């Protein structure tokens, strides 16, 4: 389409509204109520432009650019005097009741209302009357509520209700006393409630965790990083100040996590700031703990490694690709063991085989929102891969989108779309051991043991394609619901099958592969998604190696007398007694880790590794996307004695000191070149981000904003002499504001969004090619593998149905977004949000046990008797007992194990 803005001719998309079209052209129009992801409603009335009927029209008419289509031959004026006057008037009317709060408001310097007040040119108050005031609510540990600062733009309710699907936030009241909050005091229940701190253009909803240690946005040191709290790999902007990680902002990625995170990745960063972390290499000599610097730690470790016969290396899915590869090089490929259990590894490599050999294209997180039918098999997506649950919700609303497009209603007119598609939605079929959080929009939910979920998947595959193995013993009502699922999946243009390794069953993954293969055989545009457990689970799977059980066998048999444990606590993948005995048998245990784990008491050397904030590296998505994360800050800038290096740096120097008896603190690109030379299936990680020699017209990329304060005083209490700026030889980023962060720079890694006049998270519009699209020069990250030309075979290992046998209790895994992940549950703000340890029981099983809700039962697993209080679960099946995976004393490896002696304490 062709539009004329102030006499200048522009070529735009005719299916867009004028606000998004003009923001994509770099024109500045103030706006509040519109969001690129939420659509247009026309509430705030801020985005007024003046429209003319034709070129020879002078009087015009004020139209609202977010509710006006950018059609062909459009004539608008942004800089008309009447339009400018009305936009200033709208800002003024908002300012009539606004509190005098900017110095004591966490949004200050990051406030979209501040930006638009300045942009409209309103700085003179002529209102002399009183301001309305509001009481605040308690919204839990993460979100702080201040209703005085509200401008009634309805973005919070539109996001939280129409988009995120939450049910406990609403708008109450009338004319000018509208109140946005919960119906009563209490914790916000949605797993995506954290995105309110960036959706809300004012300081009503703010990060309480950041408000504890607040610093303004210009004072942050930002870096582009990847969230480490599950496998989805959402792009984040961690920002630090005075040597501690302060905030996790969302970093826009038009391919993965566009505007939104989940609450785990947004609020579980606090393990970085723990005071019991290793900050220096420590050697155990007798009962003494001798602190070493880097050189003598490497010398002592190298001498002990050289005098030993066999050295084994136990990696982790927490650690980066470079760190795991460095351990693999240090100990040898045949001596390298993945730190996960055998069953977890088998499920992980099956998921990898389905992804990169099954011939079915695995979608990105953004592309999930365009699929016409969703089948979720075994995976509690909301508790393990939450952003996939949000994308599934958008794909479910796709049906109302199609219905509204049939009536020639534009895509941005969200209220008309939601009105036309009243309760019609795309088919969603979830399976779990109990209820999920997707049941509100699920067309059907199947609560069954993992064997029965796998059997339902195999039966769906057999009904879609008869060449798939048949399932015997399907009940007639279950067969009718299977036929319902088959009619929904067969008629869909774009079906999507989601599964993962968290269900604890190989057969669930096989059934999901069978359903996807059966749908692909009918010519459907089927996609498959696998949810891995940790941030680098697929990277550790691609690298490969033995299981943790094999490493413990080597340690127990005495064939290995030296073990190097990289970023692994070893208790979440094996029994603690066996791990403790095997590590106590070894004459050298060396733990390279950044968190104080329980295996450091037996360790003879502890290398203080760096976390994601203090390190660079590469991690692989659950969809196989290689993504670089860069270091946020130098840990040694404030504490000079802190020796906290990257894990791959420690291990590469240990290998060099073992070989040639000299330390070698290498560079990151050297390690990446070693990875892509030795492991050809990881060759895509070279293109994940450019090397350390990348420049924007000769200058590095800035980590901190250009108005960074306190340069000559932030360290003055330690020494009045200003230290040297920290040198970053590893990446293209500089540890200063002497660098480039221009929105028109030819890069893809943006540490933070800021433009002159846009200090808010709305500054991301400048860094994108079109608003709500991708970044201007493409999103960061690269897929490791393409869709295979040829598929797999049908898996014919159909399990039998679940038989509840006496004395045994099948452990059904329950996952919690706050508690199942290890590092995030170590973060101190999560203990308030964490559930209490509750063991879930069927009413029939609890009645048989003589146990009611709340009383404490004792059960022995692996010779260890532990006691938990009983919660009644109606949705569970008899013979199963529910356990929260990843919590204290309950390893996630218990998923699928049996239980003994479940009796009342």
Among 12, 33, 16, 5, CA closest to 762 = 33
Asked whether position 66 contacts ligand FES by CB under 6 A, the answer is: yes
Q: Return d(Cα 261, Cα 824) in angstroms, integer.
A: 15
Is the distance from CB of 676 to CB of 686 less than 8 angstroms?
Answer: yes
Out of ligand SF4, another protein, ligand FES, none, what residue 47 binds, judged by CB under 5 to 8 A for its kind, is: ligand FES
Among 5, 53, 594, 608, CA closest to 292 = 608
Residue 402: is it exposed, middle or buried by C-beta count within 10 angstroms (0-12/13-18/19+)? middle
Rg (CA), the chain: 28
Asked whether position 156 contacts ligand SF4 by CB under 6 A, the answer is: yes
CB of 134 to ligand FES, least distance (A): 22
- CB atoms closer than 10 angstroms to residue 820: 25
Taking the least distance from each CB to Ca ion, the nearer of 263 and 730 is 730
Taking the least distance from each CB to ligand SF4, the nearer of 155 and 572 is 155
Taking the least distance from each CB to another protein, the nearer of 170 and 875 is 170
Q: Return d(Cα 504, Cα 621) in angstroms, integer.
A: 20
Out of ligand SF4, Ca ion, another protein, none, what residue 462 binds, judged by CB under 5 to 8 A for its kind, is: none
Asked whether position 150 contacts ligand SF4 by CB under 6 A, the answer is: yes
Taking the least distance from each CB to ligand FES, the nearer of 163 and 648 is 163
Q: Among residue numbers 871 through 890, which ones bind ligand SF4 (CB under 6 A)?
A: none
Asked whether position 183 contacts another protein by CB under 8 A, the answer is: yes
Interface residue with ligand SF4 among 78, 90, 94, 204 (CB under 6 A) is: 204
Q: Would you state the structure tokens that stand for residue 659, as one six-digit string?
A: 């070989």
Out of ligand SF4, Ca ion, ligand FES, none, what residue 43 binds, judged by CB under 5 to 8 A for its kind, is: ligand FES
Out of Ca ion, another protein, ligand SF4, none, what residue 377 binds, judged by CB under 5 to 8 A for its kind, is: none
Among 414, 415, 368, CA closest to 395 = 368
Q: How do strand 495-500 and strand 527-531 relate by DSSP bridges? A: parallel
Q: Among residue numbers 404 through 463, which ones bind another protein (CB under 8 A)?
A: 407, 409, 413, 415-416, 419-423
Out of Ca ion, another protein, ligand FES, none, what residue 817 binds, judged by CB under 5 to 8 A for its kind, is: none
Asked whether position 101 contacts ligand SF4 by CB under 6 A, the answer is: yes
Q: Tokens 């009481």 sit at which residue?
A: 135
Q: Among residue numbers 719 through 738, which ones bind Ca ion (CB under 5 A)?
A: 730
Q: Return d(Cα 252, Cα 397) in angstroms, integer.
A: 22
Q: Return d(Cα 401, Cα 418) in angstroms, integer.
A: 8
Asked whether position 700 contacts ligand SF4 by CB under 6 A, the answer is: no
Out of ligand FES, Ca ion, ligand SF4, none, what residue 730 binds, judged by CB under 5 to 8 A for its kind, is: Ca ion
Please tell me the count of residues contacting another protein according to CB under 8 A: 26
Interface residue with ligand FES among 5, 23, 64, 326 (CB under 6 A) is: 64
312 three-class SS: strand
Within 13 Å and on the Cβ side, how many CA atoms surround 510?
22
Among 203, 198, 200, 195, CA closest to 105 = 203
Q: Which stretch binds ligand SF4 (CB under 6 A): 107-115, 312-320, 652-660, 790-798?
A: 107-115
CB of 35 to ligand FES, least distance (A): 9
83 three-class SS: helix
228 three-class SS: coil
Taking the least distance from each CB to Ca ion, the nearer of 547 and 631 is 631
Which residues partner with 207 through β-bridges? 143
867 three-class SS: strand
Taking the least distance from each CB to another protein, the nearer of 309 and 423 is 423
Among 66, 68, 32, 41, CA closest to 158 = 41
Interface residue with ligand FES among 5, 12, 22, 44 (CB under 6 A) is: 44
DSSP run (H or E) holding 668: helix 668-678
Sign of CA dihedral 12, 14, 17, 18: positive
Q: How do strand 589-593 and strand 562-566 relate by DSSP bridges? A: parallel
Determine phi and psi for 771, rounding to 5 degrees.
Answer: -70, 135
Binding string, residues 362-401; x marks residues near ligand SF4 by CB under 6 A: -----------------------xxx--------------
Is the distance from CB of 515 to CB of 377 less than 8 angstroms?
Answer: yes
419 three-class SS: helix
Interface residue with Ca ion among 114, 384, 445, 631 (CB under 5 A) is: 631
CB of 199 to another protein, least distance (A): 17
Taking the least distance from each CB to ligand SF4, the nearer of 156 and 503 is 156
Q: Which residue's beta carbon is nearest to the bound ligand FES?
A: 66
Interface residue with ligand FES among 12, 43, 298, 319 (CB under 6 A) is: 43
DSSP H helical ranges for 810-882: 822-826, 830-833, 843-849
Q: Among residue numbers 6 through 35, which ones bind ligand FES (CB under 6 A)?
A: 19, 31-34
Q: Return d(Cα 583, Cα 246) in angstroms, integer.
A: 36
Q: Which stretch binds ligand FES (CB under 6 A): 43-51, 287-295, 332-340, 814-822?
A: 43-51
Which residues contact another protein by CB under 8 A?
A: 41-42, 67, 161, 167-174, 179, 182-184, 407, 409, 413, 415-416, 419-423
Residues that bind ligand SF4 (CB under 6 A): 98-99, 101-102, 105, 107-108, 111, 113-114, 149-156, 180, 199-204, 227, 229-230, 232-234, 257, 261-262, 264-265, 385-387
Binding site for ligand FES (CB under 6 A): 19, 31-34, 42-47, 64, 66
Site of interaction with Ca ion (CB under 5 A): 616, 631, 730
């Amino acid at each position: 389409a062709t539009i004329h803005v102030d006499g200048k001719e522009y070529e735009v998309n005719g299916a867009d509204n004028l606000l998004e079209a003009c923001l994509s052209l770099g024109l500045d129009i103030p706006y509040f109520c519109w969001h690129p992801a939420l659509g247009s409603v026309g509430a705030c009335r801020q985005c007024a432009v003046k429209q003319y009927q034709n070129a020879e029209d002078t009087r015009g008419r004020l139209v609202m650019s977010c509710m006006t289509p950018a059609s062909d031959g459009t004539f608008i004026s942004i800089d008309d005097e009447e339009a400018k006057q009305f936009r200033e008037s709208v800002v003024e009317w908002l300012m009539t009741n606004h509190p005098h709060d900017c110095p004591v408001c966490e949004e200050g310097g990051n406030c979209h209302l501040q930006d638009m007040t300045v942009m409209t040119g309103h700085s003179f108050r002529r209102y002399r009357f009183t301001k309305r005031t509001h009481r605040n609510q308690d919204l839990g540990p993460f979100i702080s509520h201040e209703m005085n600062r509200c401008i009634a733009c309805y973005r919070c309710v539109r996001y939280y209700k129409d988009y995120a699907g939450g049910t406990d936030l609403g708008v109450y009241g009338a004319h000018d006393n509208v109140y946005f909050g919960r119906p009563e005091d209490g914790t916000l229940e949605s797993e995506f409630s954290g995105n309110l701190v960036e959706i809300c253009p004012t300081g009503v909803f703010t990060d309480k965790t950041h408000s504890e240690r607040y610093n303004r946005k210009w004072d942050m040191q930002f870096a582009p990083s990847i969230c480490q709290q599950c496998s989805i790999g959402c792009n984040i902007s961690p920002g630090e100040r005075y040597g501690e990680l302060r905030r996790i902002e969302n970093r826009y990625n038009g391919t993965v996590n566009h505007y939104f995170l989940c609450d785990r990745g947004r609020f579980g960063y606090g393990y970085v700031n723990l005071k019991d972390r290793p900050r220096q290499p420590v050697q155990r000599r007798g009962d003494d703990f001798i602190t070493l610097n880097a050189e003598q730690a490497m010398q002592g470790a190298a001498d002990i490694l050289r005098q030993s016969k066999k050295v084994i290396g136990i990696g982790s899915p927490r650690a980066s690709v470079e760190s795991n590869f460095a351990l693999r090089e240090l100990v040898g490929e045949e001596n390298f063991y993945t730190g996960i259990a055998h069953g977890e590894q088998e499920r992980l490599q099956l998921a990898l085989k389905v992804l990169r050999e099954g011939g079915i294209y695995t979608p990105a997180l953004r592309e999930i929102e365009s699929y016409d039918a969703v089948l979720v098999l075994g995976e509690d997506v909301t508790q393990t891969g939450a952003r996939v649950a949000l994308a599934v919700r958008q794909a479910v609303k796709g049906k109302a989108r199609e219905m509204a497009a049939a009536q020639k209603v534009a895509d941005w007119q969200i209220a008309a779309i939601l009105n036309i598609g009243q309760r019609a939605k795309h088919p969603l079929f979830v399976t779990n051991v109990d209820d999920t959080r997707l049941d509100d929009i699920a067309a059907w939910t199947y609560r069954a043991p993992v064997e029965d979920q796998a059997r339902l998947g195999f039966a769906i595959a057999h009904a879609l394609d008869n060449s798939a193995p048949a399932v015997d013993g399907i009940e007639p009502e279950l067969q009718s619901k299977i036929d319902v699922i088959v009619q929904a999946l067969a008629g869909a243009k774009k079906p999507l099958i989601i599964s993962g390794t968290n269900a604890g069953s190989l057969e669930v993954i096989q059934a999901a592969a069978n359903v996807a293969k059966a749908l692909k055989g009918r010519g459907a545009d089927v996609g498959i998604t696998m949810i891995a457990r940790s941030v680098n689970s697929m990277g550790l799977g691609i690298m490969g190696g033995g299981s943790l059980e094999e490493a413990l066998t080597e340690l127990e048999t005495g064939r290995a007398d030296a073990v190097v444990v990289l970023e692994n606590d070893l208790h979440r993948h094996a029994s603690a007694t066996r791990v403790n005995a095997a590590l106590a048998k070894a004459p050298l245990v060396m733990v390279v880790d950044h968190q104080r784990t329980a295996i450091m008491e037996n360790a003879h050397l502890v290398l203080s590794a760096a976390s994601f904030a203090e390190s660079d590296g590469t991690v692989i998505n659950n969809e196989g996307r290689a993504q670089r994360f860069f270091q946020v800050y130098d840990p040694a800038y404030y504490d000079s004695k802190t020796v906290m290096l990257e894990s791959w740096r420690w291990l590469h120097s240990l290998h060099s000191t073992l070989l040639s008896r000299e330390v070698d603190w290498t560079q990151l690109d050297h390690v990446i070149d070693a990875v892509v030379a030795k492991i050809p299936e990881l060759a895509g990680i070279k293109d994940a981000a450019p090397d350390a020699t990348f420049r924007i017209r000769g200058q590095k990329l800035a980590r901190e904003p250009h108005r960074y304060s306190g340069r000559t005083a932030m360290r003055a209490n330690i020494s009045v002499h200003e230290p040297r700026q920290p040198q970053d030889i590893d990446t293209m980023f500089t540890f200063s504001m002497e660098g480039n962060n221009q929105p028109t720079a030819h890069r893809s890694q943006v540490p933070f969004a800021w433009a002159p006049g846009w200090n808010s998270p709305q500054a991301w519009n400048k860094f994108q090619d079109e608003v709500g699209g991708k970044l201007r020069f493409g999103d960061p990250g690269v897929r490791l593998f393409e869709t295979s030309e040829n598929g797999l075979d049908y898996f014919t290992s159909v399990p039998a149905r679940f038989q509840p046998q006496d004395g045994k209790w099948r452990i059904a895994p329950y996952y919690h977004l706050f508690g199942s992940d290890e590092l995030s549950q170590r973060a101190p703000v999560f203990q308030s949000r964490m559930p209490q340890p509750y063991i879930k029981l069927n009413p029939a099983d609890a009645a048989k046990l003589g146990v009611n809700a709340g009383t404490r039962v004792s059960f022995s697993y692996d010779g260890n008797t532990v006691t938990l209080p009983v919660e009644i679960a109606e949705g569970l099946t008899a013979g199963q007992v529910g356990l929260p995976m990843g919590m204290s004393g309950i390893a996630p490896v218990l998923a699928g194990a049996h239980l003994e002696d479940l009796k009342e304490a």
